[PDB]
Design a protein around this ligand. Structure first.
Ligand SMILES: CCOC(=O)N1Cc2ccncc2C1
Ligand SMILES: CCOC(=O)N1Cc2ccncc2C1
Ligand SMILES: [Mg+2]
Lengths: 150, 151
């Protein structure tokens, strides 16, 4: 159906962007809103309300640029905003070598049903935060399975 | 001012802030503002954004060596319609011979539309505008803002 085709196109755009950023160890933080509304966090960023593309997602997270610090938040198959604030988790159970992008991802996942993707700037490792837990060192197949399950 | 007028002023502020930032850093840029001649055929050659304008997004689009930096950004009113768009290259003899493809594309679209195109040179940081087949070079920040306000 059209809705299914659109969802698959968005998953493909995300995975292509994440793969590029992982290869180059470009830090990224991408939160996908689900049933819990995230308007209060969307409002802390720069409004975009843009069509998703791999190209736009890559250009947002280039280091040393206006939009690269903070989270992209996606809603209704669009990029709602970039450079958004997310709450930092205080969980003592996050790997201690991880920094603030990952604590922000876990933090938003503790108070919403959202799915957040993180690319580490240290390793290019890809992780997902959901329900207060961080799933680390994902393969491409693993991230795609999580997006489809979501 | 009406909401339409306030929105126009915000869009001008966003454009001038981005152009000034790119000029300073010698970031090449090509930014076409659609007017009354519709530019759908050219918008459709790029990557669709349909995004709200911000200075931050404009700058991020043109960072060198990134997916969106080559080709034109085409704006419709208060939105960035698409990036990395193709424009026709002018063959006008009044384009300074040292200028490259971004200036030629800008003059080219300006020959077949009433659009206003801004160009930042990656070589010099100079700011120019193409309109109605003419290129106006070495604009001050003040001159660019006035041209946009009058447009
Ligand atoms: C568009 C400008 O944005 C910023 O300078 N920050 C830094 C920053 C750091 C952590 N979370 C969000 C943000 C947004
Ligand atoms: C999104 C990818 O964009 C591109 O690779 N282009 C568009 C474009 C438009 C005009 N001249 C050169 C190029 C290269
Ligand atoms: Mg002069």
């Amino acid at each position: 159906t059209p809705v299914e085709e659109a969802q698959q196109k968005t998953i493909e755009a995300i995975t292509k962007a994440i793969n590029y950023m992982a290869k180059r160890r470009i830090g990224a933080l991408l939160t996908i809103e689900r049933d819990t509304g995230m308007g209060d966090y969307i409002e802390t960023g720069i409004p975009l309300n843009a069509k998703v593309s791999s190209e736009l997602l890559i250009n947002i997270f280039i280091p040393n640029t206006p939009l690269h610090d903070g989270a992209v938040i996606m809603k209704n198959n669009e990029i709602a905003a970039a450079a958004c604030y997310l709450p930092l988790s205080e969980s003592p159970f996050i790997s201690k070598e991880l920094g603030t992008r990952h604590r922000a991802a876990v933090g938003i996942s503790e108070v919403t049903d959202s799915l957040t993707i993180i690319v580490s700037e240290e390793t290019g490792g890809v992780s997902v935060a959901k329900n207060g837990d961080l799933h680390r060192e994902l393969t491409e197949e693993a991230l795609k399975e999580m997006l489809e399950a979501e």
